[PDB]
């Protein structure tokens, strides 16, 4: 989830 957050946000 942190990686997905970095990418999208």
């Amino acid at each position, epitope marked *: *989830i*942190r*990686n*997905k*957050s*970095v*990418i*999208l*946000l």
Partner: antibody
């Protein structure tokens, strides 16, 4: 492309159960997540977990689901959900869903493709 | 975890009319926000993603708007085929920690008055 869930059944409190989501018309590749969402009878949608479709196997979970639920990519066309410690609070239709994308590198964090659902009933 | 407060729980409007659904986020969220239509016995159908972009084949009488902590779905030129339960959904997360995921509103039942 389509999805179909299977494995729902009547199970006793305390039981474990594995659900399967089978993809047709595509196989998993990078650029999106595959996820499970459930819906108790007469209630709303509740997200459970996602897994990267890119082959890494990286997963992330709703806080309530950590420790009782595991999502896996079992093949290039199947996602599974292993559920444990089941109670009546877990009775629900369980949906498999594919995250949509408008570019090739990652998705847009909404679910564009859904299976019809499979029903899990936790009862004695 | 973000909580989406979706109102109203139910709404009725005439054929040809307009229904408006509001979703309020418990904290500021990004525009990775979506809306779904669910008919009984069917899975949800994605209507709008990124707050206001129409999914393929969805007509522009479905209009997603808003930002920050308040998002809105406006359904105009209502048809009997629009009778369904609608849900909002937020994606939320943190660049710093292993926190985030997907939060759904509680749903709005739409009754179309013919």
């Amino acid at each position: 492309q389509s999805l179909e869930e299977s494995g729902g059944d009547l199970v006793k409190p305390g039981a474990s159960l594995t659900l399967t989501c089978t993809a047709s018309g595509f196989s998993f590749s990078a650029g999106y997540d595959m996820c499970w969402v459930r819906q108790a009878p007469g209630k709303g949608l509740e997200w459970i977990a996602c897994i990267y479709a890119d082959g890494s196997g990286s997963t992330y979970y709703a806080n309530w689901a950590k420790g009782r639920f595991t999502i896996s990519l079992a093949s290039s066309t199947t996602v599974t959900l292993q559920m444990t410690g089941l109670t009546a609070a877990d009775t629900a239709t369980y949906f498999c869903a594919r995250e949509g994308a408008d570019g090739p590198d990652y998705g847009y964090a909404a679910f564009s493709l859904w299976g019809p659902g499979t029903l899990v009933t936790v009862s004695s | 975890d973000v909580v989406m407060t979706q109102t109203p729980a139910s709404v009725e409007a005439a054929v040809g009319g307009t229904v408006t659904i509001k979703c309020q986020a418990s904290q500021s969220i990004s525009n990775y926000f979506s809306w779904y239509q669910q008919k009984p016995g069917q899975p949800p159908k994605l209507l709008i993603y990124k707050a206001s972009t129409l999914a393929s084949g969805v007509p522009s009488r479905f209009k997603g708007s808003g930002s920050g902590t308040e998002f809105t779905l406006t359904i105009s030129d209502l048809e009997c085929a629009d009778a369904a339960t609608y849900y909002c959904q937020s994606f939320y997360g943190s660049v710093t920690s292993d926190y985030g995921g997907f939060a759904f509103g509680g749903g709005t039942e739409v009754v179309v008055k013919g």
